[PDB]
Ligand binder design. Structure first.
Ligand SMILES: Nc1ncnc2c1ncn2[C@@H]1O[C@H](COP(=O)(O)OC(=O)CCCC[C@@H]2SC[C@@H]3NC(=O)N[C@@H]32)[C@@H](O)[C@H]1O
Ligand SMILES: Nc1ncnc2c1ncn2[C@@H]1O[C@H](COP(=O)(O)OC(=O)CCCC[C@@H]2SC[C@@H]3NC(=O)N[C@@H]32)[C@@H](O)[C@H]1O
Lengths: 235, 229
């Protein structure tokens, strides 16, 4: 009855009034590629390293089952599909979302959405959390807070699913194409602190042909950052 | 993202752009009670006796998983829950639907919806097909044809699900109530043909059986079958 016209993402949608985590459900259950798992609220939503992701009613909490037939070295770019998808949807609603490498979307430097990809090969789960009309943690923001009015959640869902479907289809044909879109919508040219085994500061210059963040330290040394167990902070 | 506020029916909804049959999927898959299966279109939609139910885009084709711990004798009233639910939804949209025993809803004697209940031991599947904006077979009608304008399918879905949830919750407590709502909303006092024999459809009894008075004065009770008006 939703009348979705997408080719892959959204062929099937499983909705929950409440769930522990859409990513956990998606990873665990036997689901066809393109299946979208969405819930009004999550009781155990999570980000990277089991950090908690607040998921109250009013927001868009979903996961998408993917089985991308592309080289293993390209799988790390899946997170960008989610980030760009969110950015395109925000722009459709006249909200200036910008990417904080490699999985967050900010509006005026305040987090409005986060992406979490989990997947060991042939089954990849793309999780996306976007604050729409829900209350948010201090320092974060939402579409409602940005526009000054409630936003039809279903409309945001339709927009995002349509964008992701298109982005995914092109990714299957040309895995490298997404990098250009990320670059055009990413926060760059500013000082950042990279936190991992130790830490360093520098100018976030660009992302390379693999999606690695290129940082120029004051010494002139160039470091290529692989996203994994590393966080980025603005100075 | 649908923000459904129902208690049982609609706690979960599985949507398909296309499916063979929502009833078949519901029967062969393990689903929690209240799970709603809905699809834009069915390729093998069916009615009674494996009859085909046309299910093109534009209509509401769904199935609901139920597991009511009520007496076996009450299970035959589940079909009425679906029928009355449809009637209530139609009224919300200013349409007067009338039930044709035991599973059809008519508007000015033209079929606008059909109900199909199937019990699989570990669950009961309540299937409902309602013509909204889709093309319908000759002799049938739809909400669009009755109102003269496209009707938001999601609005109809929300309305029907809310009505069914309320009907079902009460049914679990007062199984008898549904019959009275059915009597108040079904086509009676008219001559019908049961398949055969003809007579006046007088009413439904405490078991939901159609009571027919033949011209001889004989009274027959129908448990199941097709009714031609
Ligand atoms: N609602 C919210 N809005 C903005 N920031 C939030 C937030 N809730 C938590 N945060 C902050 O963001 C951090 C998490 O950031 P990370 O970059 O690691 O992690 C993320 O940004 C990924 C979040 C992915 C969420 C979706 S919801 C659908 C699916 N089901 C799940 O269980 N997860 C996925 C936390 O440590 C908080 O400080
Ligand atoms: N779209 C339509 N609108 C009105 N009448 C139709 C119709 N499609 C077929 N018919 C006629 O209605 C008859 C079927 O009548 P019956 O009384 O036996 O059967 C019914 O009236 C029950 C139909 C139940 C349909 C739903 S769709 C969701 C779920 N998934 C399924 O596969 N089934 C359920 C056919 O023999 C046709 O003559």
């Amino acid at each position: 009855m939703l009348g979705l016209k997408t080719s892959i993402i959204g062929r099937r949608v499983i909705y929950f009034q409440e769930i522990t985590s859409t990513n956990e459900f998606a990873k665990t259950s036997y689901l066809e590629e393109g299946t979208v798992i969405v819930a009004d609220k999550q009781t155990m939503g999570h980000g990277r390293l089991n950090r908690k992701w607040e998921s109250p009613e009013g927001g868009l909490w979903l996961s998408i089952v993917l089985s991308p037939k592309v080289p293993q070295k390209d799988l790390p770019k899946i997170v960008f599909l989610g980030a760009v998808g969110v950015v395109e949807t925000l722009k459709e609603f006249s909200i200036d979302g910008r990417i904080k490498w490699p999985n967050d979307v900010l509006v005026n430097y305040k987090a409005i959405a986060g992406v979490l990809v989990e997947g060991k090969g042939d089954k990849i789960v793309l999780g996306i959390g976007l604050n729409v009309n829900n209350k948010v943690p201090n320092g974060a923001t939402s579409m409602k807070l940005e526009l000054g009015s409630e936003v039809p959640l279903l409309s945001v869902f339709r927009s995002l699913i349509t964008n992701l479907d298109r982005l995914y289809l092109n990714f299957l044909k040309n895995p490298m194409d997404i990098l250009n879109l990320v670059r055009d919508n990413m926060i760059l040219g500013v000082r950042v602190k990279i936190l991992g085994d130790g830490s360093f500061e520098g100018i976030a210059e660009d992302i390379d042909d693999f999606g690695r963040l290129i940082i120029r330290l004051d010494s002139g040394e160039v470091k290529k950052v692989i996203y994994g167990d590393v966080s980025l902070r603005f100075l």
